[PDB]
Amino acid sequence: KCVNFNFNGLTGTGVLTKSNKKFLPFQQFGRDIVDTTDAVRDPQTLEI
Amino acid sequence: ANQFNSAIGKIQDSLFSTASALGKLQDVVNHNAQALNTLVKQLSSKFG
Numbered sequence: 001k002c003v004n005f006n007f008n009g010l011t012g013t014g015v016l017t018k019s020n021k022k023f024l025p026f027q028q029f030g031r032d033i034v035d036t037t038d039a040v041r042d043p044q045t046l047e048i
Numbered sequence: 049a050n051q052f053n054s055a056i057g058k059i060q061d062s063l064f065s066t067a068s069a070l071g072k073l074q075d076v077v078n079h080n081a082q083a084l085n086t087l088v089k090q091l092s093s094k095f096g
């Protein structure tokens with residue numbers, strides 16, 4: 001559902017979906033090739 | 049007729065092996081993609 005999300009101060013708008021991307025334990029978010037945020041980590045559920 | 053048939057049969061090789069041209073269309077595609085990539089990558093600059 002297209003929502004306004006605020007992940008630990010990171011503000012944005014979009015739909016958040018389940019991701020097959022595997023973040024290494026130290027990685028907190030992912031950026032696309034042109035430096036646009038593509039994936040994020042849930043502070044609570046540790047979900048990608 | 050035989051000479052024409054031989055030449056038209058060699059066309060299918062010489063079009064993609066000898067190169068020369070057929071790089072113009074790929075160059076057009078590459079220039080368009082480069083322009084779009086640079087435009088969307090300029091969104092990461094703070095500009096001060």
Ligand SMILES: *[C@@H]1O[C@H](CO)[C@@H](O)[C@H](O)[C@H]1NC(C)=O
Nearest residue numbers: 008041042043044045046047
């Ligand atoms: C916050 O608490 C929940 C349970 O309420 C837990 O599952 C989650 O891992 C916690 N968040 C952390 C450790 O970042």
